[PDB]
Enzyme design. Sequence first.
Site, mmCIF file in Angstrom:
data_model
loop_
_atom_site.group_PDB
_atom_site.id
_atom_site.type_symbol
_atom_site.label_atom_id
_atom_site.label_comp_id
_atom_site.label_asym_id
_atom_site.label_seq_id
_atom_site.Cartn_x
_atom_site.Cartn_y
_atom_site.Cartn_z
ATOM 1 N N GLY A 120 14.805 12.767 32.982
ATOM 2 C CA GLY A 120 15.005 13.932 32.133
ATOM 3 C C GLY A 120 16.012 14.896 32.735
ATOM 4 O O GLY A 120 16.364 14.772 33.908
ATOM 5 N N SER A 121 16.475 15.863 31.949
ATOM 6 C CA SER A 121 17.496 16.785 32.439
ATOM 7 C C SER A 121 17.502 18.146 31.747
ATOM 8 O O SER A 121 17.015 18.293 30.627
ATOM 9 C CB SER A 121 18.883 16.149 32.291
ATOM 10 O OG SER A 121 19.053 15.065 33.186
ATOM 11 N N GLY A 122 18.061 19.138 32.436
ATOM 12 C CA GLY A 122 18.207 20.479 31.899
ATOM 13 C C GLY A 122 18.703 21.467 32.942
ATOM 14 O O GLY A 122 18.960 21.097 34.088
ATOM 15 N N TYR A 159 16.912 24.312 33.522
ATOM 16 C CA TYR A 159 15.673 24.902 34.020
ATOM 17 C C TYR A 159 15.037 23.995 35.070
ATOM 18 O O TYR A 159 14.003 24.314 35.657
ATOM 19 C CB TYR A 159 14.716 25.160 32.853
ATOM 20 C CG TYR A 159 15.274 26.153 31.852
ATOM 21 C CD1 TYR A 159 14.905 27.493 31.889
ATOM 22 C CD2 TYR A 159 16.187 25.752 30.880
ATOM 23 C CE1 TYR A 159 15.425 28.404 30.983
ATOM 24 C CE2 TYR A 159 16.711 26.654 29.970
ATOM 25 C CZ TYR A 159 16.325 27.978 30.026
ATOM 26 O OH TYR A 159 16.843 28.878 29.122
ATOM 27 N N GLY A 160 15.703 22.870 35.308
ATOM 28 C CA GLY A 160 15.269 21.847 36.241
ATOM 29 C C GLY A 160 15.149 20.481 35.588
ATOM 30 O O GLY A 160 15.155 20.354 34.363
ATOM 31 N N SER A 161 15.026 19.457 36.422
ATOM 32 C CA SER A 161 14.975 18.078 35.952
ATOM 33 C C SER A 161 13.653 17.382 36.231
ATOM 34 O O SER A 161 12.815 17.864 36.997
ATOM 35 C CB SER A 161 16.116 17.261 36.573
ATOM 36 O OG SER A 161 17.383 17.822 36.272
ATOM 37 N N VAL A 162 13.476 16.240 35.582
ATOM 38 C CA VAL A 162 12.371 15.357 35.889
ATOM 39 C C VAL A 162 12.959 14.014 36.311
ATOM 40 O O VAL A 162 13.954 13.558 35.745
ATOM 41 C CB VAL A 162 11.429 15.171 34.689
ATOM 42 C CG1 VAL A 162 10.231 14.323 35.082
ATOM 43 C CG2 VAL A 162 10.979 16.521 34.155
ATOM 44 N N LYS A 189 8.803 16.686 38.938
ATOM 45 C CA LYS A 189 9.464 17.723 38.165
ATOM 46 C C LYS A 189 9.953 18.813 39.102
ATOM 47 O O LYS A 189 9.174 19.362 39.885
ATOM 48 C CB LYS A 189 8.508 18.294 37.115
ATOM 49 C CG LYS A 189 9.084 19.394 36.235
ATOM 50 C CD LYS A 189 8.018 19.915 35.273
ATOM 51 C CE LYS A 189 8.567 20.995 34.354
ATOM 52 N NZ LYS A 189 7.504 21.557 33.472
ATOM 53 N N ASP A 233 2.853 24.904 23.532
ATOM 54 C CA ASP A 233 4.041 24.081 23.362
ATOM 55 C C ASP A 233 3.663 22.621 23.153
ATOM 56 O O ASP A 233 4.252 21.725 23.761
ATOM 57 C CB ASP A 233 4.989 24.208 24.556
ATOM 58 C CG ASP A 233 6.416 23.779 24.214
ATOM 59 O OD1 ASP A 233 6.780 23.814 23.014
ATOM 60 O OD2 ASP A 233 7.170 23.405 25.137
#
Length: 337
Positions: free
Chosen positions: A18-20, A22-25, A40, A136
């Site tokens: 995962g990516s972003g 705000y941080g990744s996984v 995470k 969420d």
Amino acid sequence: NKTAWELPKTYVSPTHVGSGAYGSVCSAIDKRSGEKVAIKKLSRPFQSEIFAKRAYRELLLLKHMQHENVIGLLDVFTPASSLRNFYDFYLVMPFMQTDLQKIMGMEFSEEKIQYLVYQMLKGLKYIHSAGVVHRDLKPGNLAVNEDCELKILDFGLARHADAEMTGYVVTRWYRAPEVILSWMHYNQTVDIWSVGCIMAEMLTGKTLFKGKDYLDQLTQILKVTGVPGTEFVQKLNDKAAKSYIQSLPQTPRKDFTQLFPRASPQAADLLEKMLELDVDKRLTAAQALTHPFFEPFRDPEEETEAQQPFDDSLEHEKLTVDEWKQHIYKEIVNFSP
């Protein structure tokens, strides 16, 4: 990778998933046990008071939570040596396989829908019993393995439920109407609404309410839901929300049998009770588990609840980012002999 992971030697072969910003996984292999895990990274938790408070909530929620349908915390670490160089940290938890967002194109029989939604509500009963609201719930946050086992994910927006809570919450397409209509004064049933939106999506392969902005989402919702009578209009504590409704575009209230064809009378009944506009008439997690739709799978002995209420002592406190870091760093180190 965004921005250069610093793992211990206990976790190896860092494959990204995962990516972003705000941080990744990323996936990794624990070298002590050989298990595959999900890691995470919280890359900017101390950019603001809100980011710090959320990082704290997420860690403690993950820490104190023990249920078959809720993601657990295996480990937490930080490359920092003290508070002087504390900028980020990493959460470690069981690797899953896929999530519900990825397989929405699949065809879900009612048996599968029964089984998967039942697991959602079991986990949700547990989370709510701890006095916690998720805020969420969406297909991306529902992990699923090859056995169709389900786990609830992402407590980054979760918190202890209070009378007044943060207004702009939940992902729009799964966001309950009262988040807008009753600004900052919703309860745990916002999660039940999300479950309803998800179930309908499994039933059709289409997202039920695809609003283009927060207000259009309300308009999409009030198309399926009817525009309420004067009983609900006066049942609110807002004048601003009294408006817009006052534009009375009326034709309440649709029947879910005609709105969800090729779905069972009772499946339509459950969606109806979950997608109820009035929060008082809306199904709770415990109540939803007792619905006739889940009779083939229901087993009350596995519908467990929290052994201890989730602590909310700092929730009504005014900490600085430096103070939040201290509490977070403290809770990172005492884990878990």
